[PDB]
Design a binder for these strands. Structure first.
Length: 270
DNA sequence: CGTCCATGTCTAC
DNA sequence: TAGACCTGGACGG
């Protein structure tokens, strides 16, 4: 998952858990290296917000719930496979690694953090990752300024296909979005990032870093992902113009990750 | 059986 | 920077 997936996951949690009351402990699969979540409430609601490639749950005990408890924030990163799913308490998926259980009345449900591969991670802090750039979806002006102010940074020596994955400046952009973005402007992926950015100091590279992932969010669906039917997944595959599409060339950036492009690879190519 | 590939970090050398 | 962290699917023989 990349920014749009984290965003729709946030929306999924909020819409699904609007009318739900949770109760009891927050349960961790005994194979997850991530920390135990010390939290018990007789009655609590669950809300979410997203910032680039991170999502924040807030667990909010209701009035008079017991034990006396202050709200608790957890921040998730999903790595290659994470996901959130509302399931029947007795049909936990394989790889439901963290699990929030509905109190009665109503049919017993588990909001599960599902992460097949265990590249996902969570922290008790409630805080966004120190160093991560602003969210390209929700802090666009902040995102734009945070780049143009810092072209001096060695980050921008790298080729543009590489800089776009540095979450310090492009929080929320990942390997499908970088491909999709450059294709829209036909910027060679191994053009030097400083050259392409110095220019702006008919939409431009930074406009698209916002608007292109925002197109994924406005499919509905779960962006690149199977939930909301294996119907919405094909609605994404049809949106894609570059990433994996027949006809397109592809190469490995200096860190093994595959960039899909059309035509000219550009000057700093392997 | 086997090999390779996948929406991302994270860290040891 | 090579390597680690993981599982499973789409392919090969």
């Amino acid at each position: 998952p990349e920014g749009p997936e984290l965003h729709l996951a946030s929306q999924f949690v909020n819409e699904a858990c609007r009318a739900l009351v949770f109760g009891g402990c927050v349960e961790k699969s005994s194979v997850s290296r991530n920390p135990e979540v010390p939290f018990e409430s007789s009655a609590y609601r669950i809300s979410a917000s997203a910032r680039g490639k991170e999502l924040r749950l807030i667990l909010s005990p209701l009035p008079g719930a017991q034990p006396q408890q202050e709200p608790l924030a957890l921040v998730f990163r999903f790595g290659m496979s994470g996901s959130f799913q509302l399931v029947p308490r007795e049909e936990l998926p394989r790889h439901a690694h963290l699990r929030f259980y509905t109190a009665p009345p109503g049919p017993r449900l588990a909001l599960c953090f599902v992460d097949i591969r265990r590249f996902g991670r969570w922290d008790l802090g409630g805080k966004w990752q120190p160093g991560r750039g602003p969210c390209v979806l929700q802090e666009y002006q902040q995102f734009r300024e945070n780049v143009l102010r810092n072209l001096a940074d060695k980050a921008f020596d790298r080729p543009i296909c590489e800089a776009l994955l540095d979450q310090r400046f492009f929080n929320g952009i990942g390997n499908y979005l970088r491909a999709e973005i450059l294709y829209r402007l036909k910027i060679p992926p191994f053009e030097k990032a400083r050259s392409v950015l110095e220019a702006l100091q008919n939409p431009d590279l930074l406009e698209l870093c916002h608007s292109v992932p925002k197109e994924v969010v406005q499919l509905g669906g779960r962006g690149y992902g199977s939930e909301s039917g294996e119907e919405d997944f094909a609605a994404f595959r049809a949106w894609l113009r570059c990433y994996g599409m027949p006809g397109m060339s592809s190469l490995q950036d200096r860190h093994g990750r595959t960039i899909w492009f059309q035509g000219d690879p550009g000057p700093l190519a392997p």
